[PDB]
């Protein structure tokens, strides 16, 4: 199987024999030593590389990206960030002038992220570089550098890649997919690859029978529907975030702290749901907003409410040959409010994720959608709490009196992220939070300005 892509301006055709090899290894094996390996798990950014295609250009972690994925795209690494004649990119010179590097080892990844941001003129630095760790500089000088280079015409040589292209199964349509999966129930379906690549790089696994969903345009659509929005499984977390900025700011704000921009750019909601991790951040939110999920097997097509998809820790309502095809969201939910609690704000796994949706009949509580991740082997509504809440008045004290029911809805774990006591106490704290916030009170540490 042969693929093609542009590499740092040059056309490249490659014989894939192992479809699981990561982009990071192919590269270092070709001598493109400039992309570094700092963790090989998606957290450090040190392997960041820039891809481009019709949707445009973005920065992603080469260690999470297997080869097949870059077919038909343009790829830019740190060695190709400079112009062909050797002129440095405005971001490179700025890093030199402002001392944005010390040991140098995270410098490439920073430069590539920075260059990608510069190419689309994005300026939300804290979010764009969250996923690039630097242990030496304190970050300050890297910010000065980004600021300083922002007033510079974009690199022309980088945009010229736009004009480009104009073993393992690679479906082009949902139909082709459905057909084939149905025949190979046991296959390993790879979308973003952000949870699967850790099976090969860390668990040292080997996966035969593999299919990549990232080339099914029809699986990655956002369709306006009569009664909501239909979100394809292959939609990336980044894209879902962009859409949500309008109709679902709360979910949008949540997705802000979903991994890093680099992972968001390729991870999918379908994947976040199919992985079925009780610490997924997607599920709790969606359940609080009462969305629905759509499975599919050949031409068949079930359709339950999201929360019902999760049976037990590590086990889902999924049939041999069956795959997730989309989820559906209501056109609105102003009651939604999402809370994530971790040791660090950016790029961390939740100790607890709290999603709350309360509808009111003036002062009275009509409906109560309350979801949690990381409180149990599965994401789930807090029934007894929800229940006791109906009909009661929406004041802090009523909520204060129902908290204990949470200790009946869940019995959290203890582990390196947090103690059971803390988890518990935090689920309860999220509830106080919600009233206080809706009642217009200052509650968020991240909104405090110096």
């Amino acid at each position: 199987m042969e693929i093609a892509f542009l590499l740092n301006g040059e056309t490249r055709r490659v014989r894939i024999e192992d479809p699981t090899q990561s982009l990071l290894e192919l590269l270092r094996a070709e001598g493109l030593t400039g992309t570094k390996e700092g963790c090989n798990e998606g957290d450090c950014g040190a392997c960041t590389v820039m891809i481009r295609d019709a949707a445009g250009s973005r920065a992603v972690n080469a260690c999470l990206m297997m080869l097949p994925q870059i077919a038909g795209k343009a790829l830019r690494t740190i060695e190709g960030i400079a112009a062909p004649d050797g002129r440095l990119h405005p971001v490179q010179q700025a890093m030199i002038d402002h001392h944005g590097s010390q040991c140098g080892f995270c410098t490439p990844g920073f430069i590539v992220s920075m260059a990608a941001a510069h190419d689309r003129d994005r300026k939300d630095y804290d979010d764009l570089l969250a996923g690039n760790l630097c242990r030496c500089t304190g970050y300050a000088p890297i910010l000065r550098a980004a600021e300083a280079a922002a007033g510079e015409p974009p690199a022309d040589w980088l945009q010229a890649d736009a004009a480009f292209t104009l073993p393992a199964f690679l479906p082009e349509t949902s139909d082709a997919l459905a057909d084939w999966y149905l025949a190979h129930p046991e296959a390993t379906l790879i979308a973003g690859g952000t949870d699967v690549s850790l099976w090969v790089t860390k668990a040292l696994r080997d996966l035969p029978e593999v299919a990549f969903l990232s080339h099914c345009k029809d699986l990655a659509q956002i369709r306006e529907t009569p009664d909501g929005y239909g979100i394809g499984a292959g939609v990336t977390i980044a894209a879902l975030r962009a859409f949500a900025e309008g109709p679902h700011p709360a979910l949008a704000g949540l997705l802000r702290r979903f991994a890093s921009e680099q992972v968001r750019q390729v991870a999918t909601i379908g994947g976040n749901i199919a992985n079925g991790s009780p610490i997924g951040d997607g599920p709790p939110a969606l359940i609080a907003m009462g969305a629905s999920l759509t499975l599919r097997r050949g031409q068949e097509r079930r359709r339950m409410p999201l929360e019902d998809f999760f049976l037990e820790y590590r086990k889902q309502d999924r049939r041999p040959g069956e795959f997730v095809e989309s989820v559906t969201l209501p056109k609105s939910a102003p009651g939604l409010r999402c809370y994530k609690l971790s040791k660090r704000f950016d790029q961390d796994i939740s100790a607890v994720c709290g999603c709350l949706n309360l509808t009111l009949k003036g002062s009275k509580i009509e409906t109560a959608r309350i979801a949690f991740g990381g409180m149990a082997g599965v994401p789930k509504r807090a029934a007894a709490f929800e229940a006791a809440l109906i009909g009661q008045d929406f004041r802090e004290d009523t909520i204060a009196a129902a908290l204990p029911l949470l200790a009946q809805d869940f019995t959290p774990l203890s582990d390196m992220r947090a103690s059971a006591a803390y988890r518990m106490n935090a689920a309860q704290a999220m509830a106080l939070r919600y009233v206080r916030e809706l009642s217009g009170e200052a509650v968020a540490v991240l909104e405090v300005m110096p």
Binding site: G38, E41, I78, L143
Partner: protein, 760 residues
């Protein structure tokens, strides 16, 4: 050139991805790759070791065990041995037991997972308490130092505070992981590695191979980060590559994959600190009694000097008439702890800062005045001493703090914060000032030496070579500046070459913030021999006196005539005058006795202070640093740009230590936090939103290279201020002692908020 804010010698190379680190070096096609098989038991005898499935794993060429080691099996930087491969028993989860060489890194890792090992488990020591119970320790008993009589002083004290608190460890998290490469070289070997201490690598490989030192050469051009984590844990990889290489006849490379790195290597020692401190009615301290329990891991490594350094700093920034320290170095079955920026300093210092704060809350006094009242006296009959007996003749803290408090707008801001708190019920702001006093030099005295070698070629360009290693701190740029300043020429004519034990021998680790102080002297010593030879030559030629020959800015001047540095050099060449020179420097005035805890172990102290302001969420503990203002003393800095940069980076590293960074082990000894996804260093948005750093610019009193002061480690202690601020915020939520423990994670801040709120 000294004094100018010039970029790191490798800025452009960093920014274009041209800079090479160890794993980027080109190597022969036949190079093997290595990986260790690790113990899954915290403590046990090994009973069976079936390696057959390993030998049969694809791509594997050789497999090794302690019995294959041809000679020494010992990676320790200290007199007691630490095997490289397990000898019949294991002592922690992670100890390497066998070694695989395969034709690829993956193939090595994979094979390293297929052994069948049987163990005979034994009771494991994992907690300080267990350690104390069992009397598991190093140095057969605690170390105790005492000045005057504490119990007497604390019995008669108007005010008093007793307390106990944990301080967790810290993982280095150098972005480039441990790594090394060994190439057979007819008779001997050449090792390339990523280490702060190539002479030790040389020493340990030689012993592992049965070779005299002169048959092993170590080169090292740059590390992507060290922070003390590569002072010694480089020894295992190098030993392993050398041994594999000797046996297979081929070049051998080993890099740890991240998870392995965190499970095998050491971390900053965690401490438990118990204190009693007391004062006068006016607020002058009367005495302080501390007990230190330090978790060291299964082997001594650098625990000794580390714990000595904590004792040496238990006085923090204050004069204390009576003081006692009783220091336990507790052996347990976990990763053997090691150096980390600060090297004991921060633990002992943080011990006294906590105390004094506790004292201050107790007497309802403002922590800042109490501190300010007890700083050692300014300089310029009988100078005050430290508890180890060293005159403190350079304390500028008084002036400095004052100056920082004004520039920082301290007083006003404190009120703005009080107001703001009273109006809020869910959030609370906090602010604190914290000072720093850190001694410079290794406390093992004889490591305070450094060498260099310099060459001028006939076109006038210069190659400088010294014993320190570059790990991002700008050492190389600073030595470039010292040489260009001492020879009178432009820096661009000076080129730095890789650290190499065959050019400057018997070096010490680059550490203890002594890299630039000592290598700078050595570089100057060499450059001065050269200049002397050139002046002597210009003087005889132009008939006049050497001291009247001027070198400046690429020009030489004598008897009214003037010439380019190159022409002087070409003529010196024709006249047969050697253009090559070594240089050496031994820090003077040092001497002290560890056991008695008396002497002058430091040349001088570095100082600084920081004021940090943060906010916390009273419901969950979530929190963040809003603003920091720092004022730090780097002497007459050699490069203020590079200094400001160390300071910023060290600040974030320290606060990282005391907030999100947390190590956790499970009931059986396994490290649970062993990957960036579970061990959390400060991330980009964690930086302070307002970050003001400034240098105090006053030459050092002592004769250091251009009167500068080391700036690498000291600044890491400024992070205490952030912890002190987190605690100020807790203290505002209630009337009780918050007893905030370190690391101040959100779970921990929440616990301290509750104690203060009296909700348990």
């Amino acid at each position: 050139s000294v004094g100018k804010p010039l970029p790191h010698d490798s800025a452009r190379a960093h920014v274009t991805g041209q800079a090479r680190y160890l794993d980027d070096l080109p190597c022969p096609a036949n190079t093997l790759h290595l990986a260790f098989g690790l113990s899954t038991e915290a403590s046990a005898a090994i009973t069976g070791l079936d390696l057959e499935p390993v030998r049969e794993s694809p791509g594997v060429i050789a497999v090794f065990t302690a019995a294959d080691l041809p000679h020494d099996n010992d990676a320790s930087p200290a007199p007691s041995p630490e095997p490289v491969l397990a000898t019949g028993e294991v002592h922690f989860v992670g100890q390497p037991i066998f070694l695989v060489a395969a034709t690829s890194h993956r193939a090595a890792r994979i094979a390293a997972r297929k052994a069948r090992i049987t163990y005979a488990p034994r009771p494991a020591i994992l907690t300080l308490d267990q350690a104390l119970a069992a009397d598991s320790r190093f140095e057969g008993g605690p170390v105790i130092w005492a000045r005057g009589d504490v119990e007497t002083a604390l019995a008669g004290a108007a005010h008093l505070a007793e307390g106990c608190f944990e301080i967790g460890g810290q993982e280095h998290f150098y972005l480039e992981g441990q790594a090394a490469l060994a190439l057979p070289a007819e008779g001997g070997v050449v090792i390339h590695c990523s280490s702060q201490h190539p002479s030790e690598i040389q020493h340990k490989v030689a012993h592992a191979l049965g070779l005299a030192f002169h048959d092993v050469r170590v080169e090292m051009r740059r590390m992507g980060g060290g922070f003390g984590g590569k002072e010694s844990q480089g020894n295992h990889l190098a030993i392993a590559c050398a041994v594999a290489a000797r046996a297979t006849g081929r070049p051998c490379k080993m890099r740890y994959d991240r998870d392995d790195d965190m499970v095998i290597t050491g971390k900053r020692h965690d401490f438990r600190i118990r204190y009693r401190i007391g004062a006068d009615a006016s607020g002058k301290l009367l005495g302080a009694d501390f007990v230190h329990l330090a978790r060291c891991g299964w082997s001594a490594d650098l625990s000794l000097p580390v714990c000595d350094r904590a004792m040496l700093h238990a006085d923090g920034s204050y004069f204390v008439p009576a003081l006692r320290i009783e220091s336990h170095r507790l052996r347990t079955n976990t990763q053997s702890n090691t150096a980390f920026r600060g090297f004991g300093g921060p633990q002992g210092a943080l011990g006294m800062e906590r105390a004094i704060e506790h004292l201050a809350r107790g007497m309802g006094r403002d922590p800042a005045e109490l501190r300010a009242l007890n700083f050692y006296d300014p300089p310029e009959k009988k100078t005050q001493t430290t508890h180890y007996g060293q005159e403190v003749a350079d304390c500028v803290l008084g002036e400095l703090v004052t100056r920082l408090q004004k520039s920082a707008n301290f007083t006003t801001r404190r009120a703005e914060i009080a107001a703001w708190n009273s109006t809020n019920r869910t959030l609370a702001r906090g602010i604190a000032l914290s000072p720093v006093k850190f001694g410079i030099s290794f406390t093992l005295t004889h490591l305070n030496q450094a060498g260099a070698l310099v060459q001028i070629y006939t076109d006038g360009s210069v190659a400088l070579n010294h014993g320190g290693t570059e790990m991002g701190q700008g050492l190389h740029a600073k030595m470039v500046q010292v040489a260009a300043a001492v020879l009178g020429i432009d820096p661009v004519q000076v080129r730095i070459t890789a650290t190499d034990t065959s050019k400057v021998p018997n070096t010490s680790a680059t550490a203890a913030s002594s890299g630039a102080d000592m290598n700078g002297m050595a570089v100057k010593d060499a450059c001065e021999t050269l200049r002397g030879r050139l002046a002597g030559f210009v003087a005889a030629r132009e008939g006049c006196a050497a001291r009247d020959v001027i070198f400046d800015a690429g020009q030489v001047q004598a008897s009214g005539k003037s010439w380019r540095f190159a022409e002087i050099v070409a003529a010196a060449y024709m006249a047969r005058i050697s253009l090559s020179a070594t240089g050496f420097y031994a820090t003077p005035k040092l001497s002290w006795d560890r056991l008695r805890g008396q002497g002058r172990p430091f040349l001088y102290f570095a100082y600084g202070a920081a004021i940090t302001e943060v906010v916390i969420d009273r419901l969950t503990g979530e929190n963040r640093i809003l603003r920091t203002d720092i004022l730090h003393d780097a002497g007459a800095s050699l490069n203020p740009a590079l200094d400001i940069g160390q300071i910023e980076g060290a600040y974030v590293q320290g606060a990282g230590w005391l907030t999100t960074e947390e190590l956790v082990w499970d009931h059986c000894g396994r490290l649970m936090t062993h990957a960036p996804s579970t061990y959390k260093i400060p991330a980009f948005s964690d930086r302070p939103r307002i970050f003001n750093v400034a240098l105090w610019d006053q030459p050092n009193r002592e004769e250091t290279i251009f009167r500068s002061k080391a700036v690498g480690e000291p600044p890491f202690l400024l992070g205490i201020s952030a912890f002190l601020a987190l605690h100020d915020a807790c203290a505002a939520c209630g009337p009780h002692w918050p007893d905030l423990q370190a690391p101040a994670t959100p779970e921990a801040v929440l616990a301290a908020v509750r104690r203060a709120e009296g909700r348990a």
